[PDB]
Amino acid sequence: AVDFINYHASDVLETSGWKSMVVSHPHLVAEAYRSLASAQCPFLG
Amino acid sequence: SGPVAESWCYTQIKVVKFSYMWTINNFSFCREEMGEVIKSSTFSSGANDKLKWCLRVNPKGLDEESKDYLSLYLLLVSCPKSEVRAKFKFSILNAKGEETKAMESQRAYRFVQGKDWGFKKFIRRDFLLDEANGLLPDDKLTLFCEVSVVQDSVNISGQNTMNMVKVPECRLADELGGLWENSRFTDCCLCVAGQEFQAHKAILAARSPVFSAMFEHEMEESKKNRVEINDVEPEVFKEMMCFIYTGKAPNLDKMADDLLAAADKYALERLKVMCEDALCSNLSVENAAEILILADLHSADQLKTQAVDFINYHASDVLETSGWKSMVVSHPHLVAEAYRSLASAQCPF
Amino acid sequence: VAESWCYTQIKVVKFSYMWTINNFSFCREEMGEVIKSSTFSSGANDKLKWCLRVNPKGLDEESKDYLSLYLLLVSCPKSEVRAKFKFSILNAKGEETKAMESQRAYRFVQGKDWGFKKFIRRDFLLDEANGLLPDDKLTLFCEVSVVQDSVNISGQNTMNMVKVPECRLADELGGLWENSRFTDCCLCVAGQEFQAHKAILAARSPVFSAMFEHEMEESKKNRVEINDVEPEVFKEMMCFIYTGKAPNLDKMADDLLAAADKYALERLKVMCEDALCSNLSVENAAEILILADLHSADQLKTQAVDFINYHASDVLETSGWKSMVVSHPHLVAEAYRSLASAQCPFL
C-alpha cells in the first residue's frame, strides 16, 4: 500500500482518508516519505 | 600618466546566458530509426517570456553523412521577430556531473524562426555506445547545453566630467545611530525584561507598523511614556533597534535564530527577510528540522521554501537526525507538506 | 550548471511469454507446417494480442535445415506498432546462450506478422548432447518490447537566494515628513506654520540643536520662529534633512545655498555648490563669486576664481565685475593673488 500511494501520490493526497491519516497517524506519513525518498532518487534536480 | 582625463565611456553589449540540460532515459533502447526526431519541450532564458529555444537531436543523424554519426541541432521556436543571434556550446556529462566531452561553437550564428544551426555530425556514436566509456550511466544519456545570446548595439556617452566637486556620501544612516548610542533626548521609555532603554516615537512608528499601532491606540492617553517589551532578550533587542534606527544590523549572523522571531513579532519585513537570508545560508542536514520549524512558526515564506527544498534534496540522511523525529512527533503538517512538495519533484514515477 | 530539465521519459512496455511443447521430439506427426499457438497478452487490460507460431518441419526450401520461430499479431487497433523482441530459452536444464535477437524491429500492423524463420539447425537441436529437449519438452522465451512515443517533461529547475528589499530608511522618513506623524514642534516661515519633529531635526542640523538643547524647549519648540528663508526653499531644505535627497536642487541653487549655510548643513551646502558650479557663464561669475565668498563656501569660491581667471577677457566688460570692484575689493584682491602665482607666470 505504501508503494501504491507513492506511485499514485498525485491523486491520493486529494482524498479524505489521507487528510485524516495526516492528523491521526503521522508516522505513517513518515514511512511514506521514507519509502518515497530513501528508496528512490536522484532525479535530475 | 594623466589619470581620469575627462571621459569614462563604457559602451555595453547585452549578453544573456542560460543553460539547458537534457536527459533521455534508456537512450539507445528504441528511439526509432532513420530520420526521426526527439524534439524537446521549448525553453526560454528565464528573464521574462519572449524568446523560445528548443533542442532536437537525431540519434540516427539524417543524410548519408550522419548515418554513422549522431547529429544535434538547436532551433528557434517563436519570438518577436528581430533575428536574434547567439553562440552556443554542447557537452555530455557523466554520473558525477563532470564535463567529459564538450563542443563549443567558434562563431555566433544567425537564428531566425524555422532555421537551426547546430553541431551537425556531432560525434562518433560508437564512442558513446562503449559501456566501458562510462558516459551512459544507467543507459541515460545526459546532454548539457549553454546558449549565449548577445543582443549588443548599445553605446553610452560616458561621463564627460568638467565638474569636479565632491558631495560627501549620505549620513542619514549614521546620524540616526547618533540618536541611539548617545540617546539624544528621546520621548518614550521601553523596557526589555526590567532593563532600561530610551527611544523615540516617530522613527519607531514609521519603520515598525506594530509599534505605530501600539503607540497611538489606547496608549497615547495613559501609558505614553512607559511600555514593557517583555518577550525578547536585550542582547538581540539592541540589534533590532540598531536596525530600526541606522537601517543595518551588524551582529546578525551570530544571533539570527531569535532575531527572526523578534523581527516577525513587530512586522519588520526587511529585517525578517535579512534574518531569513542569514539562516538560509547556514542550512545543514543536522538542523534542517529546526530551521523548518522556525520558518513555519514565525510565518517565514522564503526560508520555509528553501528549507523544504533542502530537505527534499538531502532526505538521505536527515531522516536519522533527532530533529526529524522531533518534528514528526510534534509537527505532522510540516512532514505532510514536505511529502507533498516531494510528490511534484518525484511525480513521474 | 542547469536551468531546465526535459526528461521526456520514453514509454516502455516489457512483457514475456513461453511456449512449452511437451512432445517436440515426436511432433513431426502431425506435419509441422504450422504450430498455430494460443493468444497471449499483457500491459493495459490485455489490449495487445500475440502468439508464437512455430514451423518445426520444412515448410520452405531451406526450412529442412534451420528451424523457424515466427511471431504473430492476432489483433491490435493501432497500425504503427514497433516491437524489439528477444526470443530465448527459459533454462530448463543449464542453457541460456544460442538465443540471438533482432535488435531492429518493423511495423506490426493489424493482420501482418513479421518475425523470422532461420533459428537453429535441426540435428543440433534434436541432439541430446546439447540438452535442448529436457524431458521431451522445450520452452521458449520472447521479451517482446513494444513502445509508443509521446512523452515530454517540462521542468523548471529554479534556484535563487532570498532577495532583500532595499533600505527604505530615507523613503519612510520622507513619508514621515509629509504625513507628519507624532509631530513634536511647529516651524514657522513667512506666515506658514510648518510642523516637524525634534529628534531628526536637531540631529541633522547643529544650528537647530543650538536652539533645542538650551532648556528652550517649552518656550520655543511649541512656537519656534524662522524668518529668513522663503517657504519653498525651506520646504526643500526640510525634505533634505528628513530624506537626505534634494530633488529640485537645480532651479534654486542660490537661495538654497543661503538656507543650507544658515543652518550649517554641510551636505546640502556642498550640493548647492555643485549645482552652482555647472552654471558658470562668463557674465554671472561676478555674483557667483560674491555668493561663494559671502556664505563661506570653499570649493565654489575656488572654482569661480579659476573660471574668472580663465574668462576675464570678457568679465571686466560686464557690469558684474564693476560691481565687485566698487563694492568688494577683497574679492578682487583674492582673485589677483590666485592669478599671481599661477596661470601667467611665464612672461
Which DSSP helix (H) or strand (E) runs through C273? helix C268-277
Taking only Cα atoms into account, the Rg of chain C, rounded to an integer number of angstroms, comes to: 51
Q: Between residues 1 and 45 of chain A, which touch chain C (CB distance below 8 Å)?
A: 43-45
The pair phi, psi for residue C18, each rounded to 5°, is: -145, 175
DSSP 8-state symbol, C40: B
Interatomic CA distance for residues C269 and C257, integer angstroms: 5
Judging contacts by C-beta atoms under 8 Å, the chain B residues touching residue A36 are: 339, 342-343, 346
Interatomic CA distance for residues B301 and B313, integer angstroms: 18
Task: Enter the resolution in angstroms.
Answer: 3.6
**C71 CB-contact burial (10 Å; exposed 0-12 / middle 13-18 / buried 19+):** buried
Name the neighbours of B, counting chains with at least 3 Cβ pairs within 8 A.
A, C
The pair phi, psi for residue B307, each rounded to 5°, is: -65, -40
Q: Which of B56, B59, B47 is nearest to B77 (CA)?
A: B56
User: Is C72 in contact with C144 (CB distance < 8 Å)?
Assistant: no
Residue C319: which residues within 8 A CB-CB, separation 6 or more? Answer: none
CB contact under 8 A, A38 and B319: yes
Q: Which amino acid is at B76?
A: L
Cα atoms in the Cβ-side hemisphere of radius 13 Å centred on B108: 12
For cell 514497433, the residue is C82
CB contact under 8 A, B347 and A27: no
Please report the DSSP string for C43-98 in residue order.
SGGG---BEEEEE-S-SSSGGGTB-EEEEE----S-S--EEE--EE---SSS---S
Which DSSP helix (H) or strand (E) runs through C207? helix C206-210
Judging contacts by C-beta atoms under 8 Å, the chain C residues touching residue A42 are: none
User: Is C268 in contact with C295 (CB distance < 8 Å)?
Assistant: no
CB contact under 8 A, B332 and A13: no
Q: Which of C230, C284, C274, C225 is nearest to C249 (CA)?
A: C274
User: Is B294 in contact with B258 (CB distance < 8 Å)?
Assistant: no
User: Is B85 in contact with B150 (CB distance < 8 Å)?
Assistant: yes
Judging contacts by C-beta atoms under 8 Å, the chain B residues touching residue A33 are: 315, 335, 338-339, 342
> Which chain A residue's Cα is nearest to C159?
A45
Q: What is the 3-state secondary structure (H, E, C) of chain A?
A: CHHHHHHCHHHHCCCHHHHHHHHHCHHHHHHHHHHHHCCCCCCCC
The pair phi, psi for residue B176, each rounded to 5°, is: -100, -25
Beta bridge partners of B195: B192
User: Is B39 in contact with B156 (CB distance < 8 Å)?
Assistant: no
- Could you tell me if C200 lies within 8 Å of chain B, comparing CB atoms? yes
Q: Chain B: give the shortest CA distance to residue A1, in Å.
A: 15
User: Is B173 in contact with B245 (CB distance < 8 Å)?
Assistant: no
User: Is B70 in contact with B57 (CB distance < 8 Å)?
Assistant: yes
For cell 543449464, the residue is C94
Q: Which amino acid is at B196?
A: E
Q: Provide the 3-class DSSP secondary structure of residue B191.
A: strand
The pair phi, psi for residue C87, each rounded to 5°, is: -70, 135
**Total Cβ atoms within 10 A of residue B190:** 19
Judging contacts by C-beta atoms under 8 Å, the chain B residues touching residue A31 are: none
User: Is B189 in contact with B196 (CB distance < 8 Å)?
Assistant: yes
Beta bridge partners of B232: none
Interatomic CA distance for residues B292 and B275, integer angstroms: 14
Q: Provide the 3-class DSSP secondary structure of residue C10.
A: coil
Q: Provide the 3-class DSSP secondary structure of residue C121.
A: strand
User: Is C261 in contact with C298 (CB distance < 8 Å)?
Assistant: no
DSSP 8-state symbol, B41: P
The residue of A10, A41, A44 whose CB has the most chain C CBs within 10 angstroms, and thus the best one to mutate to test that interface, is: A44
DSSP 8-state symbol, B115: B
Alpha-helical segments (H) within chain B: 125-129, 174-177, 202-207, 209-216, 234-243, 256-265, 269-280, 288-297, 302-313, 315-318, 322-330, 332-345
For B54-75, letters b (16+ CB in 10 Å) and e give bbebbbbbeeeebeeebbbbbb
User: Which cell is C206 given?
Assistant: 547643529
User: Is C148 in contact with C107 (CB distance < 8 Å)?
Assistant: no
User: Is B189 in contact with B198 (CB distance < 8 Å)?
Assistant: yes
Residue B151: which residues within 8 A CB-CB, separation 6 or more? Answer: B13, B14, B15, B16, B84
Smallest Cβ distance to B41: which of C6, C163, C273?
Answer: C6
**C49 CB-contact burial (10 Å; exposed 0-12 / middle 13-18 / buried 19+):** middle
